[PDB]
Nucleic acid binder design. Structure first.
Lengths: 172, 183
DNA sequence: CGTGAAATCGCCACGA
DNA sequence: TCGTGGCGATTTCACG
DNA sequence: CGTGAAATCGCCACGA
DNA sequence: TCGTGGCGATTTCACG
């Protein structure tokens, strides 16, 4: 709600209009001006996540701005987050019982979750999914170094997997 | 009535009887009239592990030199330990009594060479780094590491071409694992 | 300085 | 024996 | 609780 | 801008 009104007032920030005039070019209160503008800066990628953007509280957009800064504010890191929970987002959007306001709530608290542990490095990439608890394949990137890590897979696989990488290097 | 030997090992026993009555071996080397050295060498063998003493057919073809390397093996392993070991080898041990031609000559050198071997693989029981392409750079590298039933490939500072290459290639390989049909 | 849920280890056991 | 699932015991790890 | 060599990390700089 | 060797600055690691 306040969001749209925000992105709408935003364009008139770049039109060369000062909050003042706008608060008047809309019959709105200057305070509500900064409110809206502020809510309009929140990280879109997350904005989108929410299925019923109408139930978002100004506090929500605000907390979102926070989950953003504390996280730097750049795309890829978001996308990193977006996926680390993407399945639960769709998971919840499957439940039927809980109201729509309870959904966003659950969803929000979720966005503050990742934000805290992923900003406390551990950039991984579950390159496979077994139904087994222990058993895995993953890639890990950190600064100027990457590494793959598998566990509990066929010795042949290991074999196969050794043989190859040895080459790609040899191809240098 | 029974007494006096030369299977060197027996002498021990007696001297062991005596050593127990609080008698310096130095005394013994005189009481009985032998060289302190040997009196220890004696005793030394008299302590060779009874069990391991067994596995041998002709304990008479056992050389001191071995006997040492035996009690050596006696304790060198906590001194359940003896039993399990008698096992792991029991086959290949007996699997040698068969072999037609060969008496107390190369029985030892194999029975031994085994008992010890399959008795060393016990006392001592982690990651295992390895290199792939030792570079020239300071900290640029490509290694494999195996801390268990889990392996992994480590890499530092490399051409984004290299990554993708693997990235896609690893996925290539992985994917190969499985395709279901029909209808 | 406990806590429980999630990733892991440890060890048993059955088929090449 | 050696390799690989399974399943319970234990370590990790973010909270309260 | 040092103490140095080697393994890593900071960051500044150079060519599509 | 971004992706890549370089070398100083520092953290790792096994001992004495």
């Amino acid at each position: 709600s306040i969001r749209e009104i925000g992105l709408r007032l935003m364009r008139m920030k770049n039109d060369g209009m000062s909050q003042k005039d706008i608060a008047a070019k809309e019959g709105l209160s200057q305070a509500k001006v900064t409110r809206a503008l502020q809510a309009a800066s929140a990280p879109e990628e997350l904005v989108a996540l929410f299925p019923v953007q109408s139930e978002l509280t100004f506090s929500d957009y605000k907390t979102l701005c926070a989950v953003g800064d504390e996280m730097g504010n750049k795309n890829l890191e978001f996308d990193q987050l977006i996926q680390n929970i993407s399945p639960e987002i769709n998971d919840i959007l499957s439940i039927e019982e809980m109201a729509e306001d309870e959904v966003k709530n659950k969803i929000l608290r979720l966005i503050t979750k990742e934000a805290s542990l992923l900003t406390d490095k551990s950039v991984v990439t579950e390159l496979w999914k077994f139904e087994d608890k222990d058993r895995f394949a993953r890639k890990r990137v950190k600064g100027r170094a990457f590494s793959y890590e598998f566990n509990r897979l066929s010795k042949e696989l290991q074999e196969e997997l050794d043989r190859m990488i040895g080459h790609i290097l040899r191809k240098s």
